[PDB]
């Protein structure tokens, strides 16, 4: 199974395969580039998450953003009942995921931040 999300680490990880990738050790200090994920399916059965080699802001994916600054809880944002939260570790690599099964009332978007040194990569998810 694939994780619909972004791998910002430079490890060649086997436990986890993401749909998108963007090596954080590439962008300018105190700047950001985005790695966007769009999901559009009738009834889902997907894992969503990221692999961050620095620090994750906020505490995704229980907390997500709306430079973002509005911290929100994912259960309130997607407004679905059963959301499974998962995590993994590979040294400094931090893998935070969430599983989503079923239908979604309203199309919702949210952002999660991977920060490494002065460089921060954003991951914005849209789900219809």
């Amino acid at each position, epitope marked *: 199974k694939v994780i619909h999300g972004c791998n910002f680490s430079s490890n060649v990880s086997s436990k986890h395969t993401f749909t998108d990738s963007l090596d954080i050790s590439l962008v300018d200090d105190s700047a950001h580039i985005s790695c966007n994920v769009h999901l559009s399916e009738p009834k889902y059965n997907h894992l969503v998450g990221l692999n961050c080699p620095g620090d*994750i802001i906020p505490d995704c994916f229980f*907390q997500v953003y709306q430079e973002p600054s509005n*911290i929100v809880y994912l259960d309130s944002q997607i407004n679905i009942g059963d959301i499974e939260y998962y995590e993994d570790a590979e040294g400094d690599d931090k893998i935070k995921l969430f599983g989503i099964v079923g239908s979604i009332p309203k199309t919702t978007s949210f952002t999660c931040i991977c920060k490494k040194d002065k460089k921060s990569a954003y991951m914005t998810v849209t789900i219809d």
Partner: antibody
Amino acid sequence: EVQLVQSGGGLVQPGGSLRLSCAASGFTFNNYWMSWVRQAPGKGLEWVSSISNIGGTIYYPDSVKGRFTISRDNSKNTLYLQMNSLRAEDTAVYYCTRDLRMSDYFDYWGQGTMVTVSS
Amino acid sequence: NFMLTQPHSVSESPGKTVTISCTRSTGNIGSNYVSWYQQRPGSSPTTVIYRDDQRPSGVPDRFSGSIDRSSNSASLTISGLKTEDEADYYCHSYSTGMYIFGGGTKLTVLG
């Protein structure tokens, strides 16, 4: 305003245990990292532990890894440092901090509380 | 990881200026933000510089930070010294999962 009111340290014999508290107010407790930073009398700042917004990330230096445990209770807006297997080298003034993770710095500090490990 | 090394002490007369260095032993000083903390005797620390050169609210522009990428060093500068500037000053930088402090610098405003 923002407040970090640290609670009660004391004297401990080596190998004992002790719990420090920090009551936080004035800001959304769930949206910030928080740390403990100590200082032995006459010496410099030494970071002790950090915890992310709601526990997603926890960091320790090897000097206390295995002996100290950081935690937080969002329903009491309180930071805790559980200290076990205390050594005399742990004698210091322990400070409570709120961090801005995005800018890698401690923006508010507590008043400190002294911890003495002596036999 | 790395170390941050400051001078043991600095001193100058009121109204004069003083600069306190923070030399990163390995890696690039420009890679991670540097922050600076003031500690008057018997008081808890307070931030005077964050993000290399940003001032928190309540810190006059007499305080300023800079970064020297060739000497691998950060600097705190205090001009127009006043008596209440007399403190211990600490530089701080963070790498992933490690928080590093400088040794500290005693600032004596000569009286």
